[PDB]
Write a structure and sequence with these properties.
Chain A: Homotrimer (Potential). interacts transiently with the RNA polymerase core complex. Interacts with RNA polymerase-binding protein RbpA via its sigma-2 region (residues 211-347) in a free form. The structure is cut from a larger assembly and holds two copies of chain A, one copy of chain B (about 1100 residues), one copy of chain C (about 45 residues), two copies of chain D and one copy of chain E (about 80 residues). Chain B has about 1100 residues and is an alpha+beta fold. Chain B is about 25% helix and about 20% strand. Classes of the chains: A mainly alpha (about 35), B alpha+beta (about 1100), C mainly beta (about 45), D mainly alpha (about 45), E mainly alpha (about 80).
Chain lengths: ~35, ~1100, ~45, ~45, ~80, ~90, ~140
């Protein structure tokens, strides 16, 4: 909402959960679930 | 001894100290940067003499500052140990000829150390082509000569200000800590009876939060800071407490929007101020901080600690208390007072060495950034010092500084005074300095601390008045960088032969005498009462033995350009400024004669110029020629001094060098062998001596104009060589490559009569306006032939290759002789820019004689265009038939307030016909006898120093005793005037008219280039107005006040046609030209194209701009 | 532009899917293409 | 020329002034130096 | 032999204004110059030089001399 | 990396350069930089052509193509009203 | 309420709709007024308007591409934000925040940046213009005139 939207974008990224191996392979399995469905 | 020509001196007082090297400000600085043999000789000489001197060269310091850097694991590192230089691959003339940069390769020894493997890779790596300063004191880049001017800048340190607010009705104090590069913090006390801190002026806060965020908590703050009511009021009104709480408070205040973190805030505060990398305070900053705050032996180099900020708190609250004398925190007793930003101890000059060091440091920082990016994406055991480092940012930064930067300026080569002034100027503009828009009255004012450090007279008189000043004649430079000045030490009233150079700081705690103070037979003061200056520039005197430092010369205040003027002490300061500002614009003439009257330092102002050829080693002359001087030295070596003849300077004037030594005469070291431009006999000579007659003459010298004889045209007195350079090149474009050739299409054979076989004009071919110099033919233009042109071509027959005549032609209003041609070819080994194939340079030289409209000037700021070149017989001649060579309006000197030039013409007359004073038993006669100006042959040059000159009594007495010329009867009466006849009428003028010999200069504001006219020429592209410029056949701008004046006359039609018909109406200009040529009346005007551009611009900002007439839309 | 006779021009009407109708000229000797853009919305 | 108007230009006015869509960002060809089709500088 | 040869105050007292005088003389000079550009077309509404004419001068000189002589008048439309 | 360098090839320059021309020209730039850091001197275009196995005229053509335009509105100096845009005919 | 009524009542009496404060289309300067002229040596010089229009067109094309497929809301919102900021920079480079510099030395001059000041059309090319049939040289005094 202020100047330098690069800072705003970086905060808009936020505290997303970083994925350890089983988490992203489970997420990829859910991607396949949704896509084949 | 015999180095200088004979010049009779009117100096009454002696000079114990001679003027130092005029080029020290450039050459010494660049030798410091290079660390060459001269610099190490200087540092060892100063070490054995005990003088303060930097022991670190400008490049070894910048390389040791780049510490061995580590990765995030702290494993591998690189280190630049030693730097060395190689001899340059090109000579100076070779660089000056083929558009090269005078540079030498720079080599450094670099090692690559990894602790885990224990591996060291020592290697030598090419860092870039390093430009070198010549001995002349200039940089030769891209074939041109550019010099770098020294830059005035605020000294880093602690600054302390006092102000009063009308609304507050109380005194407010301000504290600043400005570093060399880091962030700046601002402080102020009792804005509303509370004290605060600004961190880059971001958010509101207090001082106590900064203190608690630092290493001290509450109890020591309330203990040590125990005698100031306002600050403890601030402490008690502050609600927060605790170190971590204050740290999170400053973290959220500086950058809101993120949760507080202790490690992040601590690292941010360490990096903002306490980081050795991002707050590299220079040696000057640390020195000034420990001087002002009294910090005893703080780290000589390094970043500030908390103790510096605490001492700033001490000083600010002590100043707000009102007392001025207290002991410094962690130190001795100091003084407490506010200081202004205009004091010259707060101003430091960035010379050429420090500027180039800063640019190389920026390039090295970019290189470290690139390599730090490189190591993180590179594997170990495969990194070579030749590989990981990249020298591209370093050379990019160096070439960005030397080209297109406001400090690296195009060298003015009008005459040697212009060169010396350019190399001696100090600039306040440029990056890291004060801009012209940001300037104010306070900075421009002459400070009382400028005496001996900067010239108060000479400065540009334009919009940037006083922003750019010239260094004083005796001014030296600190190792730190402040401007020093010499003084003669005084002990118990017996002045000694010892000199100490004082900054703008020691000049306050001492009291300074004058060099004009009288002395007895010994070195004691002749009079107890002496006129002195003290701290703050107050001129109050003190009697008896109370002084402790005397000046070395009365010429200490003035620059080198200002000190040339004789009888400066009789001139006004404004006209002195104008006179010193036009002597850098005078051209050199065909053969120049040294001024008959002038300051005796004129020899030193051209001997120290590098253009005058001086002996490298003492010896005897073997052969002389107009092209070379060959001297066989005493040791037996042979050296030939090549002399530039009729070369072109940067301003177009010739730089030819005459020979003054004989065939077999003795030469000592430093003796002038060949004169430079505007020099006679090694003495400096800008203009001519002309016989002046101060009288109005039929109104042709009305309003500061000049009348002069044809005797200055037919005797070739005031004329100069003007070499003009303009070139064209041949390039391979999309259609094809244009060629230089002979077969110019559709032109008579007589036009191409003076061409060579390859399409080059002959050397020595007289050229005029519109003539052909080199014949270049455009390979192809778009062919859309009309049937009329087709049948005309069928009638006459046209050449089968379709080419367009875009060959190089002489511009309008230019005449000259082709004196030299230079041809460059891509097919040869010569380097060329990409795309081009042939490049030709043609020099044309004309001997411009004096004429109407030329601008002449004296030395005292008198100036004027030339209105009439009279015949010789029309001039008012003297009693013996000698016509005057120049006629001046005497109305100028009372209003302009420069009666020093009348003294100058009287002394010029005395120096023409010598005087014989011997045994006259008078005071001035005795003074001239003891000085030596008693037996003077006719014609010998006289010398009046700038503040020791000949007095009025001496001029009157010498006017009484001039040597006779004919009939045993001197011509000028003791009143200073002579009975002047008339040329046109013949009857004598009624009363005697002042005559004399004033040095008259010829300015470079010439008339042969100022003339410019337009009928229909080139037009601008974005808007259809005619473009501007002399070389581009432009039109004079008809500004806003012009339109106001035409509205005021009520002349609607003239204004309307000047705005529509004669510009920016594409359907109007061509029709009007057709109507004029055909003879019919001028058509009605249309609508200017710029208004249509306005409509199209507004219509694109979503503004529905529509023009509707009475009936409807358009 | 004096005495020059212009080429004969014919009017061909182009209609898009959105119903926009515009008139633009073609040369008589020039071939008439069935594919063109829309002056209003750029549709086929 | 009797009166010179101004106002907000709605999208209908912009489309009325316009003669096409500048769909592509490039300006001129890099070898033949000819203006591009349906881009900037479009002929 | 110059611009000042027609006395200006005579013109002012002959026409009682200054800007009307200049547009008046300019229109007359344009008509004269268009008469010289007729190329023998013999147009009736274009009047030649009333006062005696030199071989080469500007038509504005003829206009000022004619109106200084006072043999020509006008009316406002 | 592929999409970023494709977008940089497609949109960064004002005059559009195709991606294969961009990769050719910046490969030539990087090997020219390698030559400069190797022998410490500016190489002749013939050497760079023969060490890359293209014709020298092709090298001249591609380094003529690989140029960045200068904006029309560059100030000339101390004067502010005089711009670079009014100097061209 | 006084300022609000002095602004709102403009839209009541006048017939122009207030839709135009937020826009869907951006008109372009004709190519001569934002030229790209050939120079000597093969160099090219272009106005900054062409660069700003190129930025707007690139971002509009990228936004169209994101709307073509299924994209996350953060990415689409950021694309629309950079599109809006590029259009703002085209209409006023330097009005808000750090101006779009470009080469790294000076900010690009927008449409308004040449409708304003000593370098604008109103003060440098409309009230005062260059003229043909003009000349200049130094002056001398002549008593014989």
């Amino acid at each position: 909402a202020t100047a330098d939207p690069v800072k705003d974008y970086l905060k808009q990224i936020g505290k997303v959960p970083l994925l350890n191996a089983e988490q992203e392979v489970e997420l990829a399995k859910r991607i396949e679930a949704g896509l084949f469905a | 001894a015999s180095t200088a020509p004979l010049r009779i001196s009117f100096a009454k007082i002696k000079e114990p100290l001679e003027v130092p090297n005029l080029l020290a400000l450039q050459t010494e600085s660049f030798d410091w940067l290079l660390g060459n043999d001269a610099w190490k000789a200087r540092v060892e000489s100063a070490l054995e003499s005990g003088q303060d001197v930097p022991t670190k060269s400008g490049l070894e310091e910048i390389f040791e500052e780049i510490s061995p850097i580590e990765d995030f694991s702290g494993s591998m590192s690189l280190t630049f140990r030693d730097h060395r230089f190689e001899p340059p691959k090109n000579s100076i003339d070779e660089c000056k000829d083929r558009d090269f940069t005078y540079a030498a390769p720079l080599f450094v020894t670099a090692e690559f150390t990894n602790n885990e493997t224990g591996e060291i890779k020592s290697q030598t790596v090419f860092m870039g082509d390093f430009p070198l300063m010549t001995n002349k004191g200039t940089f030769v880049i891209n074939g041109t000569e550019r010099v770098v001017v020294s830059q005035l800048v605020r000294s880093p340190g602690v600054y302390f200000d006092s102000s009063i607010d009308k609304t507050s009705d109380k005194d407010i104090f301000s504290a600043k800590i400005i570093p060399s590069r880091g962030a700046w913090l601002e402080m102020e006390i009792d804005k509303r009876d509370m004290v605060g801190v600004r961190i880059d002026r971001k958010r509101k806060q207090s001082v106590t939060v900064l203190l608690k965020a630092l290493g001290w908590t509450t109890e020591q703050i309330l203990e040590e800071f125990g005698e100031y009511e306002s600050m403890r009021a601030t402490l008690e009104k502050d609600h927060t407490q605790g170190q971590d709480d204050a740290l999170l408070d400053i973290y959220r205040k500086l950058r809101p929007g993120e949760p507080p973190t202790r490690e992040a805030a601590q690292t941010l505060l360490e990096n903002l101020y306490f980081n050795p990398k991002r707050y590299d305070l220079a040696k000057v900053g640390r020195y000034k901080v420990n001087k002002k705050l009294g910090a005893d032996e703080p780290l000589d180099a390094g970043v500030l600690t908390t103790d510096d900020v605490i001492a700033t708190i001490k000083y600010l609250v002590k100043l707000h208390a009102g007392e001025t004398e207290t002991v410094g925190e962690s130190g001795r007793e100091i003084v407490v007072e506010t200081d202004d930003i205009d004091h010259f101890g707060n101003r430091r000059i960035r010379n050429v060495g420090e500027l180039i060091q800063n640019q190389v440091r920026t390039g090295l920082a970019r290189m470290e950034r690139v390599v730090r990016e490189r190591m993180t994406t590179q594997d170990v055991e495969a990194i070579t010092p030749q590989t990981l480092i990249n020298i591209r940012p370093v050379v990019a930064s160096i070439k960005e500084f030397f080209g297109t930067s406001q400090l690296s300026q195009f060298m003015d080569q009008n005459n040697p005074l212009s060169g010396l002034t350019h190399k001696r100027r100090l600039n306040a503009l440029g990056p890291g300095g004060l801009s012209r828009e940001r300037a104010g009255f306070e900075v421009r004012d002459v400070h009382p601390s400028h005496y001996g450090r900067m010239c108060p007279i000479e400065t540009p008189e334009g919009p940037n008045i006083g922003l750019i000043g010239s260094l004083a004649s005796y001014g030296r430079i600190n190792p730190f960088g402040f401007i020093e000045t010499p003084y003669r030490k005084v002990v118990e009233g017996q002045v000694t032969d010892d000199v100490d150079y004082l900054t703008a700081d020691e000049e306050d705690r001492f009291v300074i005498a004058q060099a004009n103070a009288a002395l007895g037979d010994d070195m004691r003061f002749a009079e107890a009462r002496v006129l002195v200056r003290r701290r703050g520039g107050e001129v109050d005197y003190v009697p008896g033995d109370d002084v402790d430092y005397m000046d070395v010369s009365p010429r200490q205040m003035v620059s080198v350009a200002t000190a040339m003027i004789p009888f400066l002490e009789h001139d006004d300061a404004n006209r002195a400024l104008m006179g010193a500002n036009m002597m850098r614009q005078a051209v050199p003439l065909i053969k120049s004669e040294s001024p008959l009257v002038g300051t005796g330092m004129e020899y030193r102002s051209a001997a120290d110029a590098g253009d005058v050829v001086k002996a490298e080693k003492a010896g005897v002359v073997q052969e002389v020629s107009a092209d070379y001087i060959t001297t066989t030295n005493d040791d037996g070596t042979y050296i030939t001094y090549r002399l530039a003849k009729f070369s072109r300077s940067n301003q177009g004037t010739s730089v030819n060098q005459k020979v003054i030594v004989a065939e077999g005469d003795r030469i000592i070291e430093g003796q002038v062998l060949a004169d430079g431009p505007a020099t006679e006999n090694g003495e400096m000579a800008l203009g001519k001596n002309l016989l002046v007659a101060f009288m109005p003459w039929e109104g042709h010298n009305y309003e500061d104009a000049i009348i002069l004889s044809q005797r200055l045209v037919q005797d070739d007195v005031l004329s100069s060589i003007h070499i003009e350079e303009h070139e064209v090149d041949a390039r391979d474009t999309k259609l094809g490559p244009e060629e230089i050739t002979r077969d110019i299409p559709n032109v008579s054979e007589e036009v191409l009569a003076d061409l060579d076989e390859r399409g080059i004009i002959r050397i020595g071919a007289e050229v005029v306006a519109g003539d052909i110099l080199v014949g270049k033919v455009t390979p192809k233009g778009e062919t859309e032939l009309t049937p009329e042109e087709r049948l005309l071509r069928a009638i006459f027959g046209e050449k089968a290759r379709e080419v367009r005549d875009t060959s190089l032609k002489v511009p309008h209003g230019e005449i000259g002789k082709v004196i030299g041609v230079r041809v460059f070819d891509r097919e040869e080994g010569d380097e060329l820019p990409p795309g081009v194939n042939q490049l030709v340079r043609v020099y044309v030289a004309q001997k411009r004689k004096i004429t109407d409209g030329d601008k002449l000037a004296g030395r005292h700021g008198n100036k004027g265009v030339i209105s009439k070149i009279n015949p010789i017989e029309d001039m008012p001649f003297l009693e013996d038939g000698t016509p005057v060579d120049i006629i001046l309006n005497p109305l100028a000197v009372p209003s302009r307030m420069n009666p020093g030039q009348v003294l100058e013409i009287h002394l010029g007359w005395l120096a023409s016909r010598g005087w014989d004073v011997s045994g006259l038993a008078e005071e001035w006669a005795q003074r001239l006898q003891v000085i030596g100006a008693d037996k003077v042959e006719p014609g010998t040059n006289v010398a009046t120093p700038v503040f020791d000159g000949a007095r009025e009594d001496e001029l009157a007495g010498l006017l009484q005793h001039t040597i006779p010329n004919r009939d045993g009867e001197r011509m000028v009466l003791p009143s200073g005037k002579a009975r002047l006849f008339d040329g046109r009428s013949g009857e004598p003028f009624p009363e005697p008219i002042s005559v004399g010999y004033m040095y008259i200069l010829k300015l470079h504001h010439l008339v042969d280039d100022k003339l410019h006219a337009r009928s229909t020429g080139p037009y601008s592209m974005i808007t259809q107005q005619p473009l501007g410029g002399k070389a581009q056949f432009g039109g004079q701008r008809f500004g806003e006040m012009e339109v106001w004046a035409l509205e005021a006359y009520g002349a609607a039609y003239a204004l309307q046609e000047l705005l529509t018909i004669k510009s920016d109406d594409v359907t109007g200009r061509v029709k009007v030209y057709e109507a004029i040529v055909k003879g019919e009346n001028i058509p009605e005007p249309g609508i200017p194209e710029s208004f249509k551009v306005l409509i199209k611009e507004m219509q694109s900002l979503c503004l529905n701009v529509e023009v509707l007439s009475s009936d409807g839309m358009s | 532009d004096r005495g020059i006779d212009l080429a004969p021009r014919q009017a061909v009407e182009y209609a898009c899917e959105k119903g926009h109708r515009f008139e633009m000229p073609f040369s008589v000797e020039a071939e008439i293409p069935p594919e063109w853009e829309c002056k209003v919305c750029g549709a086929q | 020329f009797d009166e010179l108007r101004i106002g907000l230009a709605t999208a209908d006015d912009i489309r009325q002034w316009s003669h096409g869509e500048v769909k592509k960002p490039e300006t001129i060809n890099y070898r033949t130096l000819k203006p591009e089709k349906d881009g900037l500088f479009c002929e | 032999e110059g611009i000042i040869n027609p006395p200006i105050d005579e013109l002012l007292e002959a026409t009682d204004s200054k800007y009307s005088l200049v547009i008046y003389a300019a229109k007359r000079a344009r008509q004269i110059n268009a008469y010289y550009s007729q190329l023998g077309e013999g147009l009736l509404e274009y009047v030649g030089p009333l006062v005696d004419t030199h071989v080469h001068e500007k038509p504005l000189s003829i206009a000022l001399r004619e109106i200084n002589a006072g043999l020509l008048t006008s009316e406002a439309i | 990396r592929q999409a970023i360098t494709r977008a940089m090839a497609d949109q960064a320059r004002t005059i559009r350069i195709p991606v294969h021309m961009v990769e050719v020209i910046n490969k030539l730039a990087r090997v020219q930089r390698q030559m400069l850091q190797d022998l410490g001197r500016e190489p002749t275009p013939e050497e760079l052509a023969k060490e890359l196995d293209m014709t020298p005229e092709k090298v001249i053509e591609v380094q003529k193509y690989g140029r960045e335009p200068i904006s029309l509105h560059t100030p000339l100096g101390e004067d502010g009203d005089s711009e670079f845009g009014d100097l061209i005919e | 309420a006084l300022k609000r009524l002095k602004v709102v009542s403009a839209f009541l009496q006048t017939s122009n709709s207030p839709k135009g404060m937020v826009l869907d289309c951006v008109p372009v300067i004709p190519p001569d007024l934002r030229p790209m002229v050939q120079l000597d040596g093969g160099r090219f010089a272009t106005s900054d308007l062409n660069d700003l229009y190129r930025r707007v067109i690139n971002r509009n094309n990228r936004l169209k591409r994101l709307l073509d497929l299924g994209a996350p809301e953060i990415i689409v919102n950021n694309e629309k934000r950079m599109l809006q900021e590029a259009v703002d920079a085209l209409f006023d480079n330097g009005r808000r925040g750090r101006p779009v510099t470009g080469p790294g030395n000076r900010p690009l001059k927008s449409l308004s940046d040449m409708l304003k000041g000593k370098q604008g059309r109103f003060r440098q090319n409309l009230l005062g213009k260059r003229v043909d049939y003009s000349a200049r040289s130094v002056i001398v005094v002549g008593p014989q005139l």
